[PDB]
Amino acid sequence: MSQIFVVFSSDPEILKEIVREIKRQGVRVVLLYSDQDEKRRRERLEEFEKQGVDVRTVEDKEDFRENIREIWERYPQLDVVVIVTTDDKEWIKDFIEEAKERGVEVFVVYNNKDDDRRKEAQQEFRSDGVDVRTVSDKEELIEQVRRFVRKVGSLEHHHHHH
DSSP states (O other): OOEEEEEEESOHHHHHHHHHHHHHTTOEEEEEEOOSOHHHHHHHHHHHHTTTOEEEEOOSHHHHHHHHHHHHHHOTTOOEEEEEEOOOHHHHHHHHHHHHHTTOEEEEEEEOSOHHHHHHHHHHHOOSSOEEEEESSHHHHHHHHHHHHHHHTTSOOTTOOO
């Protein structure tokens, strides 16, 4: 029943397009922003703050998983789309672990062109309630996000993955 949507992307220009769509659908967006400089980090995510976005800053893998606990403690409604600035399998992992401990279903959508290693990643992470979606484009990812709002905005409607 309870599903949460999460996106992993290395491209900030793709990330921004995902965020605006989420806002178009009248949905909340939890951006977990990771950058190599503190000053840069703020100047980057501030563009989202001023656009009405829920941005948390992350530096490490362990710092990532704790900001996820923020979400579980903030929004039981789960009408939130979480976005993380990376394509690392570690960061994909921690989100799944924390989620399983709360007994929630997670639909993961991440962008990375080499789908070959995505095949093993799917077999590795795809759990009972945790779904794995792989795309090599911006709009291919946008579709999954839009379809999310359309599935949760009425029922559970998990079955649609394609």
